[PDB]
Enzyme design. Structure first.
Site, PDB file in Angstrom:
ATOM      1  N   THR A  47       2.759   2.015  -5.047  1.00 21.70           N
ATOM      2  CA  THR A  47       2.054   0.724  -5.010  1.00 21.70           C
ATOM      3  C   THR A  47       2.192   0.009  -6.522  1.00 21.70           C
ATOM      4  O   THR A  47       2.632  -1.213  -6.596  1.00 21.70           O
ATOM      5  CB  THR A  47       0.711   0.806  -4.511  1.00 21.70           C
ATOM      6  OG1 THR A  47       0.719   0.961  -3.166  1.00 21.70           O
ATOM      7  CG2 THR A  47      -0.035  -0.688  -4.608  1.00 21.70           C
ATOM      8  N   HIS A  54       0.590  -1.209  -0.083  1.00 24.34           N
ATOM      9  CA  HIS A  54       0.041  -0.143  -0.067  1.00 24.34           C
ATOM     10  C   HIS A  54       0.946   1.244   0.001  1.00 24.34           C
ATOM     11  O   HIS A  54       1.961   1.285   0.385  1.00 24.34           O
ATOM     12  CB  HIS A  54      -1.101   0.135   1.190  1.00 24.34           C
ATOM     13  CG  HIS A  54      -0.405   0.654   2.566  1.00 24.34           C
ATOM     14  ND1 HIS A  54      -0.200   1.736   2.710  1.00 24.34           N
ATOM     15  CD2 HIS A  54       0.273  -0.106   3.409  1.00 24.34           C
ATOM     16  CE1 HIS A  54       0.567   1.983   4.020  1.00 24.34           C
ATOM     17  NE2 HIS A  54       0.715   0.846   4.386  1.00 24.34           N
ATOM     18  N   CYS A  55       0.327   2.364  -0.599  1.00 25.50           N
ATOM     19  CA  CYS A  55       0.692   3.810  -0.323  1.00 25.50           C
ATOM     20  C   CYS A  55      -0.491   4.635   0.232  1.00 25.50           C
ATOM     21  O   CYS A  55      -1.210   4.014   1.198  1.00 25.50           O
ATOM     22  CB  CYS A  55       1.476   4.191  -1.596  1.00 25.50           C
ATOM     23  SG  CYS A  55       0.181   4.114  -2.878  1.00 25.50           S
ATOM     24  N   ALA A  56      -0.482   5.894  -0.306  1.00 23.09           N
ATOM     25  CA  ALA A  56      -1.645   6.490   0.251  1.00 23.09           C
ATOM     26  C   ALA A  56      -2.834   6.221  -0.433  1.00 23.09           C
ATOM     27  O   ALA A  56      -3.917   6.249   0.258  1.00 23.09           O
ATOM     28  CB  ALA A  56      -1.267   8.162   0.228  1.00 23.09           C
TER      29      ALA A  56
END
Length: 150
Positions: A102, A94-96
């Site tokens: 990602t 994940h990222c934001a």
């Protein structure tokens, strides 16, 4: 009981998924329920409530937003997925938002998994998760990973 985290989908079913930032205990329980035992976290600040779920191992590889993973980070990510999957465990990344950082990681894994070049790997991640891989340097990172490992 779990709740599906935002922007969640499988890239390799039962093996490798992408998602946006998880942020409730039930998001982590959902991951565990789907066989995920490792969460690769690319954000600068850890995701909320991860400490509520000790059975999930977080691997924090900090990448500034709108920047590419570095070569060591790509290699570590690939190792985590290879080793977890060999143990019958899935991995999430994940990222934001679940798109740029990602998507770049996910494309690099496809380079290895399917023996693809970056054109195909990026096209595939974008087909699966439209909007993935947001910047020119992120595209170039997949290309350079291909070149190093061809």
């Amino acid at each position: 009981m779990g709740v599906q985290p935002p922007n969640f989908s499988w890239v390799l079913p039962g093996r490798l998924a992408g998602l946006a930032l998880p942020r409730l205990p039930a998001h982590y329980q959902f991951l565990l329920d789907l066989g995920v035992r490792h969460l690769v976290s690319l954000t600068e600040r850890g995701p909320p409530h991860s400490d509520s779920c000790p059975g999930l191992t977080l691997h924090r590889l900090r990448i500034p937003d709108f920047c590419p993973p570095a070569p060591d980070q790509i290699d570590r990510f690939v190792q985590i997925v290879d080793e977890a999957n060999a143990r019958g465990e899935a991995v999430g990344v994940h990222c934001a938002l679940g798109f740029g950082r990602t998507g770049t990681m996910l494309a690099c894994y496809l380079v290895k998994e399917r023996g693809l070049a970056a054109g195909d790997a990026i096209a595939e991640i974008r087909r699966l998760r439209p909007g993935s891989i947001e910047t020119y340097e992120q595209e170039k990172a997949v290309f350079q990973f291909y070149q190093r490992t061809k």
